[PDB]
């Protein structure tokens, strides 16, 4: 049951209803547009989409009327064309002569629409209105005047960011999309509007003026600031990154991107590892040849073959580096597979893979009929996911619940109490909430990574799983990658003090304690910033950032897609793993691989599910079997459960790269002042 | 497997230690346009590009960084690189899912 409809000539068995615009989109012919935007909302303003009915005398907005009953529509009909010229002259009647300076100038949609359709002669002959700027935050550079009131951005704010601070104001001309009152508009999706804004009326200050669109090369890859793994188009003006933009992908970001990630690159430019730096006799860091340093430690770590030596990854690194370091750790007799997050491992969620997986696809989240948040507030760790659940929140009336925090998510949701309390109670169906959890179709249990530490992480996991068991009975970065390859405990809790720790990035865990240092001050530091880990570490190894490396990263869903090369390492630094493939070769325990692709073949042994970059699906261990697998432990719990972030300013700084950022510092200064 | 490596004068280095990366290009997201999106192209991997000691120019070593080629079909592209004996990284066309839209759903209640 789907209606036939004629695009200009040929018949098309179009889906029932659906807008004329979507019909021609289906035939692929493209109507001129502005205010409309899928992944947003339809609106009748900006009637640049007018098209002519096969018979009905007057044109109608293309994104308005759904197609039906064998309609024919002449997109190329002359009356349509006169209509479009008609509108375009009006839009250009006031947009200021700013093309050379407006930063949108390379690809502003308004230009191209002016070329393809708009009449070339001007025939306005009076005076343009122009208006004062409205300052808004550290980021967006509002200029207005170039504003054309496709409300768009407000439809962005009210319907996705969820903030409704900004809005239209006034009537006729003088009406303005600027928010009344000086108050600053900060939000986590504030960055994406710089993408969404039709023209140059809103463009990113940090990137401003720096470059022009026809110039930059546009590499495709994925974000690393989050393990969410959203697709992106990094853009570089020759040998140097210029600006980041989202690259649409249905399973994750879908045309959107975060915000901390959007401005994350800026930190790369500042302080960064360049040459190896030995401690001098004075204890000062001092620049050194790459060769003498690597040979030095290469001989140094042989004495302690067996245990002793203890490599320590950061929170950002690095699939190829982990396989390489893995063979570094098995060719040596004993080893320390130590991540950073204090993630519990007894009862083994790792071996079954699925327990650390987010079982439903995030693409599947809109299908779930209830969500059970645990401690962590999603916006400050999986912002895209927060966008996803909000998206369905409008699409569906489905329930959600906090278990538990006072955190300010944009939408209505039930708030609970304390960990063992509300958790084990609903687990034992003591909570009324357990009932609604019972009648719910495809229930979703959202447990944050932050909640797992909290002194007794294992207890919380056991409690939440029970809830999973009940529903079934009733019926009706640097993280997921390692667990795809079993580097548990991951926690530094193995110690047992082990001499000669080997940081991949001590900028994160070096804040903790240097307790092994009096026993052994020596710490190889393979970072890419002088932050935290470098000062308290002998022997420094310069290393590549994520833009350079081909190395894959795993989506929390378990999708394991890779970043592509962009701008090469800044100085003497090499790609991280390659230093290790050098090291093993020096030790005499040369590893079987050498090329990136040979060692992709080594993922093709040690996993080999990573070598399926977009393929989340698996045989699944089944939740009941995992439950039985964990059933033999069980231990004492406690009420409190507070997510790490809470405030947004807390969100602005996490990994060392973000604190190397100028602009993020400007933002944390901004919200605080 | 019509290998033609001997016929092309290309140095072995660049039929070997680098890879093509076939894909259909993503829409520039600043744009609302769709035209440039379609049709396969055959970008190569980036290599090193430093800086001129004088004037600061982005001096560059690799023979063929800027090369890029359009196509009508992916199979044709893969087969193309195979004729060249090229290493490759084919990627899926990722057309957006069709979506429901309704001006009146905005006015449910």
């Amino acid at each position: 049951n789907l209606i036939e409809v004629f695009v200009d000539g040929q018949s098309v068995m179009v889906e029932p209803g659906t807008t004329v615009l979507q019909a021609c989109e289906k035939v692929g012919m493209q109507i001129p547009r502005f205010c409309y935007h899928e992944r947003l909302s339809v609106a009748g303003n900006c009637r640049m989409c007018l098209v002519e009915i096969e018979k009905a005398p007057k044109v109608v907005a293309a994104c308005a009327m759904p197609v039906m009953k064998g309609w024919n529509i002449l997109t190329n009909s002359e009356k349509s064309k006169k209509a479009r010229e008609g509108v375009m002259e009006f839009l250009l009647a006031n947009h200021p002569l700013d093309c050379p300076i407006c930063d949108q100038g390379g690809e502003c949609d308004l230009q191209d629409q002016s070329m393809m359709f708009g009449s070339d002669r001007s025939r306005f002959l009076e005076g343009k209105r122009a208006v004062e700027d409205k300052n808004i935050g550290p980021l967006v550079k509002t200029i207005m005047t170039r504003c054309i009131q496709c409300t768009r951005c407000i439809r962005f704010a009210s319907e996705i960011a969820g903030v409704d601070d900004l809005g239209t104001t006034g009537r006729g001309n003088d009406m303005q999309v600027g928010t009344y009152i000086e108050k600053m508009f900060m939000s986590e999706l504030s960055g994406n509007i710089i993408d969404i804004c039709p023209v140059g009326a809103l463009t990113s200050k940090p990137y401003a003026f720096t470059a022009r669109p026809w110039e930059t090369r546009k590499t495709e890859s994925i974000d690393v600031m989050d393990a969410v793994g959203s697709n992106i188009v990094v853009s570089t003006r020759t040998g140097e990154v210029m600006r980041i933009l989202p690259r649409m992908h249905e399973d994750i970001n879908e045309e959107w991107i975060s915000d901390k990630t959007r401005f994350a690159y800026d930190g790369l430019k500042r302080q960064r590892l360049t040459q190896p730096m030995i401690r001098n006799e004075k204890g000062l860091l001092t620049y050194t040849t790459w060769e003498d340093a690597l040979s030095r430690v290469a001989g140094m770590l042989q004495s302690f073959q067996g245990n002793d030596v203890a490599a320590i990854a950061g929170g950002l690194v690095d699939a190829e580096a982990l396989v390489a370091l893995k063979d570094l750790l098995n060719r040596v007799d004993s080893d320390s597979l130590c991540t950073e997050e204090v993630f519990p491992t007894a009862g083994a969620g790792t071996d079954l893979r699925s327990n650390y997986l987010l079982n439903t696809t995030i693409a599947g989240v809109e299908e779930a009929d209830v969500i059970l948040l645990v401690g962590t507030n999603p916006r400050f760790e999986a912002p895209l996911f927060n966008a996803r659940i909000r998206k369905s929140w409008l699409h569906n009336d489905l329930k959600v619940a906090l278990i538990g925090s006072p955190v300010d998510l944009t939408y209505r949701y039930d708030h609970l109490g304390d960990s063992p309390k509300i958790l084990q109670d609903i687990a034992s169906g003591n909570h009324p909430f357990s009932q609604i959890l019972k009648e719910a179709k495809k229930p979703m249990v959202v447990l944050g990574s932050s909640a797992l530490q909290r002194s007794d992480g294992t207890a919380i996991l056991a409690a939440v799983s029970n809830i999973a068991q009940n529903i079934r009975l009733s019926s009706g970065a640097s993280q997921v990658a390692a667990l795809d390859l079993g580097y548990k405990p991951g926690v530094e809790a193995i110690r047992k003090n082990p001499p000669k720790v080997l940081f991949l990035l001590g900028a994160d865990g070096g804040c903790i304690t240097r307790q092994d240092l009096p026993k052994d001050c020596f710490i190889i530091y393979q970072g890419h910033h002088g932050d935290v880990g470098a000062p308290m570490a002998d022997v420094i190894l310069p290393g590549a950032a994520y833009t350079e490396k081909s190395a894959t990263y795993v989506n929390t869903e378990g999708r394991a897609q890779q970043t592509k090369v962009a701008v090469t390492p800044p100085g003497l630094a090499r790609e991280d793993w390659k230093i290790i493939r050098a090291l093993s070769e020096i030790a005499g325990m040369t590893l079987p691989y050498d090329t990136l692709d040979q060692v992709r073949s080594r993922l093709e042994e040690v996993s080999p599910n990573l070598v399926r970059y977009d393929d989340v699906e698996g045989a699944n261990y089944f939740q009941q079997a995992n439950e039985l697998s964990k059933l033999v432990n069980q231990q004492l719990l406690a009420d409190p459960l507070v997510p790490p972030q809470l405030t947004i300013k807390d969100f602005y700084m996490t990994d060392s790269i973000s604190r190397a950022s100028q602009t993020m510092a400007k933002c944390v200064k901004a919200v605080t002042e | 497997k019509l290998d033609i490596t001997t016929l092309t004068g290309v140095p072995e280095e660049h039929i070997k230690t680098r890879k093509v990366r076939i894909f259909v290009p993503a829409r520039n997201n600043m744009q609302s346009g769709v035209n440039n999106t379609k049709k396969w192209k055959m970008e190569f991997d980036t290599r090193e590009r430093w800086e001129n000691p004088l004037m600061g120019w982005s001096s560059t070593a690799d023979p063929l960084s800027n090369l890029v080629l359009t196509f009508s079909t992916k199979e044709d592209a893969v087969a193309f690189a195979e004729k060249n004996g090229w290493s490759f990284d084919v990627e899926e066309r990722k057309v957006p899912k069709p979506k429901s839209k309704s001006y009146g759903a905005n006015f449910s209640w």
């Binding site: 960064r272 860091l285 240092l517 002088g530 800044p570 100085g571 | -």
Partner: peptide, 18 residues
């Protein structure tokens, strides 16, 4: 001559011991 200052401005190890 070269114009537009610098690039990476890489950080260096502190003078103080440990």
């Amino acid at each position: 001559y070269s114009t537009t200052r610098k690039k990476i401005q890489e950080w260096v190890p502190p003078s103080t011991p440990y």
